[PDB]
Amino acid sequence: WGYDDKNGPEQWSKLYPIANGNNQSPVDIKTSETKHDTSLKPISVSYNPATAKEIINVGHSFHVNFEDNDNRSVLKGGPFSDSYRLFQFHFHWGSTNEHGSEHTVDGVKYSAELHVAHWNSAKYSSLAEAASKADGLAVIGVLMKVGEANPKLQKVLDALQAIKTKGKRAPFTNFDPSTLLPSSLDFWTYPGSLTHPPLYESVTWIICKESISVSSEQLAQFRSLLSNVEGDNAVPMQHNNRPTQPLKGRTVRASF
């Protein structure tokens, strides 16, 4: 599996039949059809920077991992009744600076997208277990619009120099991912899935209404990592976004 012609999104079904499921992500959010739900509570994030652990190149992308052995960093509120433990944040981008998000809004594709993932620690024993359950994961997706440079990304960009090829990892500490969210946390939520294999339909999506910025040169930096192991010929991490999937009867609720 990858994002190329040969093993990209259009082929994934050949291997993960769930790819053609009824709860696949991302989806296009048609704002004229979302449903206002008055039961939705404000999302509340309480992250501890001491939980930041490492940054790693996984080939198709890079992940920032957190210690998830306790409830030091959690997500609460929104559609939830239990708290979700923060385990990772990562990005999605495309081959062009203009079109690279996963989710679309009124058929408009953004430049990139941030995913802040958490697992249901109230109901499950570990992410492994939680990852395939319907209520296992909660992911906040934040849409990024190409424009002004965002100084909040700097620590992440700097870290990149050290995880240039596949399989490299570097300590990454004292960092609060909440510094990356927009100022207002109004949102849309829908039942969905992982946006790449294994594609489990285990995610409760929290899409921020407000987007954050990023510049061309910042995106170019993501695009500069390599999918190859060190010493092999260079193959750039050109894009890692999946096309939107049919809603198939699902409802997108808005907290506003």
The annotation places the binding site at: 60, 63, 90, 92, 115, 195-196
Per the residue annotation, which of 60, 99, 103, 239 is the catalytic one? 60
- When the beta carbons of 112 and 252 are compared against Zn ion, the nearer one is 112
Buried b (16+ CB within 10 A) or exposed e, 73-100: bbbbbbbbeebbbbbbbbbbbbeebebb
Torsion sign over Cα 155, 159, 161, 166: negative
Binding-site positions for substrate: 195-196
CB of 226 to Zn ion, least distance (A): 19
Q: Tokens 């058929």 identify what position?
A: 107
- The SS3 call for residue 33 is helix
Give the Cα separation of 244 and 169 in Å (integer): 31
CB of 102 to Zn ion, least distance (A): 7
- State the binding partner of 239 from Zn ion, ligand AUC, none, CB within 5 to 8 A by kind: none
User: Is position 118 an interface residue for Zn ion (rule: CB under 5 A)?
Assistant: no
- When the beta carbons of 76 and 115 are compared against Zn ion, the nearer one is 115
Give the Cα separation of 198 and 185 in Å (integer): 29
- Closest residue to ligand AUC, judged by C-beta, is 22
Active site residue 239: no
- State the binding partner of 27 from Zn ion, ligand AUC, none, CB within 5 to 8 A by kind: none
User: Is position 115 an interface residue for Zn ion (rule: CB under 5 A)?
Assistant: yes
CB of 83 to ligand AUC, least distance (A): 17
- When the beta carbons of 152 and 250 are compared against ligand AUC, the nearer one is 250
CB of 232 to ligand AUC, least distance (A): 27
Q: What is the separation of C-alpha 11 from the centre of its chain, rounded to a whole number of angstroms?
A: 21
Strands 137-146, 203-208: parallel, antiparallel or unpaired by DSSP?
A: parallel
Among 93, 187, 75, which Cα is nearest to 141's?
Answer: 187
∠ Cα 200 198 130 (to 5°): 50
Residue 121 token pair: 């620690």
Residues at the interface with ligand AUC (CB under 6 A)? 22-23, 115, 117, 127, 131, 139, 194
- When the beta carbons of 23 and 120 are compared against ligand AUC, the nearer one is 23
Among 85, 147, 146, 70, which Cα is nearest to 120's?
Answer: 85
29 within 8 A of 67, measured Cβ to Cβ = no
- State the binding partner of 139 from Zn ion, ligand AUC, none, CB within 5 to 8 A by kind: ligand AUC
Residue type, 203: V
Binding-site positions for Zn(2+): 60, 63, 90, 92, 115, 196
- State the binding partner of 112 from ligand AUC, Zn ion, none, CB within 5 to 8 A by kind: none
- When the beta carbons of 23 and 104 are compared against ligand AUC, the nearer one is 23
Paired with 65 in beta bridges are 54, 88
**Residues that are catalytic:** 60
Binding residues vs Zn ion (CB under 5 A): 115
